[PDB]
Amino acid sequence: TLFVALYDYEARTEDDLSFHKGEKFQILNSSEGDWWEARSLTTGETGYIPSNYVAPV
Template structure:
């Protein structure tokens, strides 16, 4: 279990939510990772829409980690 990673990720591609638990985003959007303990889906907070939900991890890249600053 990973206690609040505080990673910021940036979208590499557009993604349209397929489930009510998913978060839609467009390329370039930034999201804060709330939980990355699942291998395929990360729980995030979308920093523009403030929507919280799941995203496919392979659609984003880690922009920065707050811990490493």
């Protein structure tokens, strides 16, 4: 399942990942809590994204 960003998000540090609304992600870890480790299908960048900012495609 891919996930798609509902809103733009600007990351605070190198650990979280900035993204634009409509960006799609493949999710690598969702089991660690509510920030999921994800790779952007736009750029390939990988980092934590807030799981409440994305929805399944």
